[PDB]
Structure formats: C-alpha cells, structure tokens
Design a protein around this ligand. Sequence first.
Ligand SMILES: C=C1[C@@H]2CC[C@H]3[C@]4(C)C[C@H](O[C@@H]5O[C@H](CO)[C@@H](OS(=O)(=O)O)[C@H](OS(=O)(=O)O)[C@H]5OC(=O)CC(C)C)CC(C(=O)O)(C(=O)O)[C@H]4CC[C@]3(C2)[C@H]1O
Length: 277
Amino acid sequence: TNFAINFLMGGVSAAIAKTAASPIERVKILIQNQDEMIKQGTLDKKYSGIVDCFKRTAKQEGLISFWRGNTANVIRYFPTQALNFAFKDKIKLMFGFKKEEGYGKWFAGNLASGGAAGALSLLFVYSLDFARTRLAADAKSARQFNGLTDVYKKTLKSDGIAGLYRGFMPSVVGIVVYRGLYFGMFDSLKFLLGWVVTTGASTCSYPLDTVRRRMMMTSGQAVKYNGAIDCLKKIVASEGVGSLFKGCGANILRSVAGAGVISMYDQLQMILFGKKF
Ligand SMILES: C=C1[C@@H]2CC[C@H]3[C@]4(C)C[C@H](O[C@@H]5O[C@H](CO)[C@@H](OS(=O)(=O)O)[C@H](OS(=O)(=O)O)[C@H]5OC(=O)CC(C)C)CC(C(=O)O)(C(=O)O)[C@H]4CC[C@]3(C2)[C@H]1O
C-alpha cells in the first residue's frame, strides 16, 4: 500500500509546487513567445517586461487567468512518475558505467540515460506540455482556445498528430545539454551552489527551449519553420540573438519561487508525515 500513497502524495507535493509558481511561469511563456503572438494577431503590442506583462494580463483577463493551463502541469505528474518508477533505474543501468572506472564514460552514460529516458517519457507526455504552452500563450483581447480538450481537438483537426509534437527534437537535445551542463558545472564545484548550477544550466540551454516553444506556437498557423535549425537561424536573423533569451529572468524567478514553496511544503510535510513524499 506504501507505493500508492507515496505516489498520490508525491503527486500532491509536485502539484502544489508547480501551482504556486504558475503565474510567473505563464508570464515566462508569454514573454518568451510574444512575437509569434504578434504574427498571429493574438497580441496587440510587445511586452516591455515582467511587470508590464503582469499588469496587462491582470487587467485584461484577471487574477485566476495566471493559472491558465496549470491543469496540464498537475496531470503531467502521474504518467511521468509511472514511466520513471518503471524504466528509469533500468535505463540507468543500461547506459551506465561505474564512476570509478572513468569520467568520460560515466558522463556519456548520464547523457545517454537522461536523453533516452526523457525522450521515452516525452513520447507520451509532450502533448501536455504542448497544451500547457498553447493555453498559456493565447490571450484574451476572444480567446484562441476554449480549453485543454479544445487545444487537442483543434490542433489535431488543423495539423494532426504532428501539431501536438512541435519542437520534439530540440526538446530532447535541450534535455541532454541541460543535463550535461548541470552535472558538469555541479561536479566542477565541489547548498546554495546548486541553485547557481541550475540557473546556469537553464540559462545556457534556454535558446533550445525558446525554439521549442515558438515551434509549438507555429502549430495551427499557415506559416511554420522548416525545422529547429531553420527556426533558430530565422529568429537570430530577424530579431537578434538576445531574442532567444526572452523569459529567462522570469524563469529564474520561477526557480526561486518554486524553491521557496517546495522548501516550505517540505517542512510542513516533515511536521505531518515522518518523511517527505
Ligand atoms: C530545452 C529545454 C530546456 C532544458 C531542458 C528542459 C527541462 C529543464 C528538462 C528537465 O529534465 C529533468 O532533468 C533533471 C535533472 O537532470 C532530471 O532529474 S534526475 O533524473 O534525477 O537527474 C529529470 O529526470 S527524471 O527522470 O528524474 O524526471 C528530468 O525530468 C525528466 O526527464 C522528465 C521528462 C518528462 C522531461 C525537465 C524540465 C524541468 O524544468 O525540470 C521539465 O520538464 O519541467 C524541463 C523544462 C523544459 C526544458 C528547458 C526544455 O524545454
């Protein structure tokens, strides 16, 4: 019975952790993909910053709208953990070398394991991230999407199954790069430095995330990029390199907020239950 309750309570912890940081997350998504919104006509004028995004979004839509799409983040836990509880340890020993043998082999092992497991999860999961991004992106001025199922329906009707999986490759590569830089920077520096490593890894692997999400944005529209590389080149050529880093600061804010609320809830969990879930 221990596993069922552990699964449910882990679900609760993750749900609260993500829900608490949901507004700044949606702000991140809005600032990141604003140009696509401008092309689609969803947005009127570009966001001046985080504060401006907060003010405009709150004024036009309201307070609860800051949690738009969060349901996907809440549901996403269950299939993710189910696949990880079943395959992650198996995949780790599949590509894994002992750290005592060598570092060049072990590191590659981590890259392969993380990449394969991440891709395997995204094979079932990516739809929810897509729906999350799209639901966070469409803003009332008449909303583009009515809900989650509406996103699924209309995306399938317009683009098919391909539309649900926009930016899969740069997401996998993004996971690999983020992982490698995380473990590299962390092992090079050897509990505050962990947040520094996370911030660095997220910031350095951020352009791939931007490309991914904007590729998600191109879904359903008449015009789309000819791949992740074409997307990257077009973005850099049209808006500049810095445009690849839109929403990165808000992402960091999301990181510190998430850290805060997960710490607090972990303490409450400590008081109530013997151990954290
Ligand atoms: C291109 C990018 C940027 C860089 C890579 C990813 C993540 C950071 C990649 C990150 O990827 C996580 O990286 C962690 C640190 O190595 C790793 O932890 S560890 O194994 O214990 O070491 C997690 O593996 S897991 O098996 O425990 O669960 C892994 O999550 C997944 O593999 C779940 C997949 C469904 C993604 C997950 C995630 C996160 O912010 O945490 C998430 O899905 O929320 C991504 C956000 C989106 C981007 C941002 C993707 O757009």
